[PDB]
Design a protein around this ligand. Structure first.
Ligand SMILES: [Ca+2]
Ligand SMILES: [Ca+2]
Ligand SMILES: [Ca+2]
Ligand SMILES: [Ca+2]
Ligand SMILES: [Ca+2]
Ligand SMILES: [Ca+2]
Ligand SMILES: [Ca+2]
Ligand SMILES: [Ca+2]
Ligand SMILES: [Ca+2]
Ligand SMILES: [Ca+2]
Ligand SMILES: [Ca+2]
Ligand SMILES: [Ca+2]
Ligand SMILES: [Fe+3]
Ligand SMILES: [Fe+3]
Ligand SMILES: [Fe+3]
Ligand SMILES: [Fe+3]
Ligand SMILES: [Fe+3]
Ligand SMILES: [Fe+3]
Ligand SMILES: [Fe+3]
Ligand SMILES: [Fe+3]
Ligand SMILES: [Fe+3]
Ligand SMILES: [Fe+3]
Ligand SMILES: [Fe+3]
Ligand SMILES: [Fe+3]
Ligand SMILES: [Fe+3]
Ligand SMILES: [Fe+3]
Ligand SMILES: [Fe+3]
Lengths: 173, 173, 173, 172, 173, 173
């Protein structure tokens, strides 16, 4: 049928929102895996672990906000499998930060594609939602992950375990 | 290799814990889907939605506790895909409660199998963990879902939309 | 007809839980008898009376908790007559403490048989309920009753009314 | 005989022991009703709470009667507490009706006790019954009649919505 | 003999409890020796010293709790010499942490044997006591000590005295 | 050897300090044994038990203070076995107090020998340490234990169990 509330909401937008919901859930899963990688007795960097757990919970929050948006505009939510991450072992704190930066840039690219779709379908409410609740957050996350990678490399990671210990204490602690 | 902390932790227990982690994540996903089903403009039962969102967040919490346990005993976490739920449309509040009761009983059965495995491998710490943090919680959840189903049927749901409206207000609100 | 919530709960366990409910109600009745025995004008030991009244209300709470457990697991409560205590006159403070020690040890033996039955039926939830709420409380109750009996004997009870008076004041006061 | 006994007939002592057993019986009945409404296939929480409160109240009444027996120098003799007549209380309305009938029976026993007290010229016992039991019983009977009337008027027990709404709005 | 409170308490259990009392006292002695080793003017790692002193006092508390248990169940405490630790010089913070992990795992193995004994003698109160107050505490202590050993090796200890200095400041501080 | 902080600290003094450390640990063990003797269900004098447990912990504190002293002066701690007490059964409160007075006087004799040693080696810091933290404490403890023995004998202990009961309530309580 058609929703009593639906207005100026193109089916391509609805579909892209379902895709973005799955993507946010996937990012949440990736962050959860990294978090509990740093909780291992043979890794044992508890501030890395908590930083990535916080990222996980925020990604789940963004997915729930996209679901709420979908219901707000009168589209229908269709969920798909959440794929396991591409690694079970994240090697080191610097490698985890680099993978997280890569993930965030890929999510940002998919968000930019969704904003271009909203613009092409003349959906100003969807474009504004994407701008206010996602684009700047993505820019901030990417700047922060770049900062962390820069510091970890400059400190001598991943060769120097002292570097990751001290960065876990003084930046992430 | 072998963990410096591992002691009396059988590989079958480690594997069953990885399976249980996936199962808890799956239950979290099921509850999230039901929650946002009741947020639809054509369903619009906001206390059903929030009840199931709370269940979702608690299931994710239990999954994270199982991951922490796995790392505590010196096993290694291996994550798998989180399968999408078996339905996208949950029909009604009573049907959602019935499906949730079914889900909870299946999870309880898998937890009882894990406790029998801990007992058969003479792992008293694992059995006690399962007892203190899971079994009674499962019994309580199942009793509560049975209560809710009983009330919703006695009120005349799902034929009576007034019944689900008033139950959403007075029990779940 | 099978309850919608029943899972891994044996007929024998349900029957034994009904039996234990009746046993706890009986213990509450026995302690109530003892309490108001020490309230008599020709005994007049107010702190013995209060001690046994407190025990009686505690036993009632235990009975109600077992009734709650029975309903949680999907069993059906069936109550029986609460038999009157074996005495109307409890003779002395020392004799009442000794009778309470005997009663508590018999209730403990019943609980141990109940835990054995839960274990033989592979019911970890029921066994953990027993351990958590009853076993240690019984052990401490028995230890305290033994302490009281020892002190009363050492002081010269029951031949010395001065001893029972001073014990009622300084230990139970 | 007790050093405190004065103007306390044997028949009064026996009637008080009977009343102690009766109050304990009512406490048992209310406990059974309470946990009937805690079953997963009934699941009316405020009915359960209400009847549990009544059960504890009747236990308090029994203990007060035992205290009176000791105060007047009589001797307490306990008997078996008979199990309630039902294990399954059918519905909220049926349970309220059974509670009304039970309270009326208990009130009749208390009135016989009071008449016995005045027959034996025991003004202290008659006043004890008046002060602590008669008005409490009349108020309980009135409240239970109110509950029955409202449940019937709402469509109980045929309407499950009626019992659910009464449980929420009156007993909650 | 035979205590007035004794019930379902096997003589093998009483003996094993006496052994475990001595074991906990010995661990408290080992920890006290480590603590004051790090108090030496030629070692002078004050947070290492405090950490091991705290562990010493907690092991003393576990011993006293086992003695309370023994009296509770009606067994009779029989004490034995507390053997001096196997070393006087503990070499370094990393070596002390490694020795502590070894000791904790040996104590855990003995606790697991005691739990197996309790289970084999159908003593659910003793088994539950062991599960409640010792098993999870020992798993947590082993995980923490493993974490510390991992971090110290990672920072370059013991070849790097700066590593132990910084670990004492930032993790044990 | 020879510490960087060592000054005016004779090897005989270092050895005597190690002996005194072991002596204080032994007294702490004797007091712990007395304490839990009075915790038995067939003794059950709870304030006697608390009194002796407090003494146990204070003797442990004296031992730790001597170890701190040893490290302060540049000596090296060498620990020895803590011998089990000479009894397992302490008979009565009066007999325990008498044994405690005997032990305290023996410890005081050793402390006086240590002070004579410090004086003979012209070590005013060690002599002043002994005077400040041990001599008056030992005189006070001996006076108190003598007071308690006098009062217990006076009340008719040990032939009067009422005497020990009342002394536990009114003096140790
Ligand atoms: Ca896949
Ligand atoms: Ca792959
Ligand atoms: Ca790969
Ligand atoms: Ca815009
Ligand atoms: Ca799939
Ligand atoms: Ca499907
Ligand atoms: Ca389907
Ligand atoms: Ca267990
Ligand atoms: Ca009047
Ligand atoms: Ca009047
Ligand atoms: Ca347990
Ligand atoms: Ca001086
Ligand atoms: Fe995101
Ligand atoms: Fe992001
Ligand atoms: Fe769960
Ligand atoms: Fe659950
Ligand atoms: Fe009980
Ligand atoms: Fe009890
Ligand atoms: Fe009444
Ligand atoms: Fe009444
Ligand atoms: Fe309403
Ligand atoms: Fe320990
Ligand atoms: Fe330990
Ligand atoms: Fe420990
Ligand atoms: Fe001392
Ligand atoms: Fe001393
Ligand atoms: Fe002293």
């Amino acid at each position: 049928s058609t929703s009593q509330v639906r207005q100026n909401y193109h089916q391509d937008s609805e579909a892209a929102i379902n895709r973005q919901i799955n993507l946010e859930l996937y990012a949440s899963y990736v962050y959860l895996s990294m978090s509990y990688y740093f909780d291992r007795d043979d890794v044992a960097l508890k501030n890395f672990a908590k930083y990535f757990l916080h990222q996980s919970h925020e990604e789940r929050e963004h997915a729930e906000k996209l679901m709420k948006l979908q219901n707000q505009r009168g589209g229908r939510i269709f969920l798909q499998d959440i794929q396991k991450p591409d690694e079970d072992d994240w090697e080191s704190g610097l490698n985890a930060m680099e993978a997280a930066l890569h993930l965030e840039k890929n999510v940002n690219q998919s968000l930019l594609e969704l904003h271009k779709l909203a613009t092409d379908k003349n959906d100003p409410h969807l474009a504004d939602f994407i701008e206010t609740h996602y684009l700047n957050e993505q820019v901030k996350a990417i700047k922060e992950l770049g900062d962390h990678v820069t510091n970890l490399r400059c400190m001598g990671a991943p060769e120097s375990g002292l570097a990751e210990y001290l960065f876990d204490k003084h930046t992430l602690g």
